[PDB]
């Protein structure tokens, strides 16, 4: 569930998801996709295709089980679909986090006509 992914991204990067990423680059948005503007933008792009794998559980509201093994996210729980979901989320939080030094305030609230054709998943 977004709230989970939201907690995840927080303890990971130390930032508020929606605010700093919710509208970032060309992919991060809600119903947006196109050639990624950078490391972070790509992250979102990939986090999208990943979610496109769970055809038996909604990543929006379905809450999966996970923990934090000393500063590290660790899914492992019941069901399988919840897992893919939980695993995608962790790959996003670690992505967005690996490129903090690349976050660009100019993408924070990126227009749209400023984008291009989205890459194929």
Curated annotation (Swiss-Prot):
The record marks 105, 108 as: Important residue of the cationic membrane-docking site (MDoS). One of its GO terms (cellular component) is extracellular region. InterPro entries: PLipase_A2, PLipase_A2_Asp_AS, PLipase_A2_dom, PLipase_A2_dom_sf, PLipase_A2_His_AS. One of its GO terms (molecular function) is phospholipid binding. Coiled coil: none annotated. It is found in: Secreted. Snake venom phospholipase A2 homolog that lacks enzymatic activity but shows high myotoxic activities. In vivo, induces a mild edema when subcutaneously injected into mice foot pad. This is Basic phospholipase A2 homolog GodMT-II. It comes from Cerrophidion godmani (Porthidium godmani).
């Amino acid at each position: 569930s977004m709230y989970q992914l939201w907690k995840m991204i927080l303890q990971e990067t130390g930032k508020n998801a929606v605010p700093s990423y919710g509208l970032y680059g060309c992919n991060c948005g809600v119903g947006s996709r196109g050639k990624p503007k950078d490391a972070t933008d790509r992250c979102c792009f990939v986090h999208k295709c990943c979610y496109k794998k769970l055809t038996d559980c909604s990543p929006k509201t379905d809450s999966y089980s996970y923990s934090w093994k000393d500063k590290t996210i660790v899914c492992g729980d019941n069901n399988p679909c919840l897992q893919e979901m939980c695993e995608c989320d962790k790959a996003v939080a670690i992505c967005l986090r690996e490129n903090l030094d690349t976050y660009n305030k100019n993408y924070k609230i990126y227009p749209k006509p400023l984008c291009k054709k989205a890459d194929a998943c």
